Amino acid sequence: RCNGVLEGIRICRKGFPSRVLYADFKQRYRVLNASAIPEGQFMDSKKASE
Amino acid sequence: SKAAADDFKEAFLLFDRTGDAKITASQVGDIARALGQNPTNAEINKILGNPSKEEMNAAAITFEEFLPMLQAAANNKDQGTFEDFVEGLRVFDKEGNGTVMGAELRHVLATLGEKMTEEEVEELMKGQEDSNGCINYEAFVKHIMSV
């Protein structure tokens, strides 16, 4: 609390709390539109998730 | 209503392979589309189940159930607006010209939502996409609404 950690989380959550790292994003969710999400993730680690 | 269109009954005799005047429940989706109705496959699925009708076990039909199911699907034809079909694909690719890159439309039509086979996706792009790899969806959606 006194760190600022809990306040950074607050401000985030007002904001955009959860933030996924791209690969961490690919792997876990490729399966959703499997063909088109896998291609995206593989083709550009970032551009993929996009 | 008849306008009693008796050609719906004549088309049921062209889709029944046994000639007994019954059409299985698995053919009813594609025959509603061949009579000039586009209900989504989840809608055709729901209605069926809604009526405690299982498309998992053997099915038969009678004209007396297929006629009112086509008349219940016929009210939903007001959902077929071409403004939203061309604007969907206009938000799918940059710049001021209606062109989808080939593989973008093929992978989206096979894997997003109601799965279309890649055989049917190739049969719907055949002729409208040339060797530049760019599908002009102004003429593509025009020809898709010509059938």
Q: How was this structure determined?
A: cryo-EM
Residues B31/B12, Cβ–Cβ less than 8 Å? yes
Closest Cα in chain A to B107: A36
- Taking one residue from A and the other from B, the number of pairs with CB-CB distance under 8 angstroms is 14
Per-residue tokens: A43: 């083709």
Measured CB to CB, residues of chain B less than 8 Å from chain A are 103-104, 107-108, 110-112
Three-state SS for A29? helix
| Stretch (H or E) spanning A39 | helix A36-43
Gyration radius (Cα) of chain B, Å: 18
Q: How far is A35 from chain B (nearest CA, A)?
A: 6
Residues B137/B100, Cβ–Cβ less than 8 Å? yes
Q: How far is B107 from chain A (nearest CA, A)?
A: 6
| CB-CB under 8 Å, A35 with B111 | yes
Q: How far is B126 from chain A (nearest CA, A)?
A: 21
Residues A30/A41, Cβ–Cβ less than 8 Å? yes
Residue type, A47: K
Phi-psi domain of B17 (left: phi exceeds 0; alpha: psi -120 through 50; beta: other): alpha
Measured CB to CB, residues of chain A less than 8 Å from chain B are 33-36, 39
Q: Which residues of A touch B112 (CB under 8 A)?
A: 33, 36
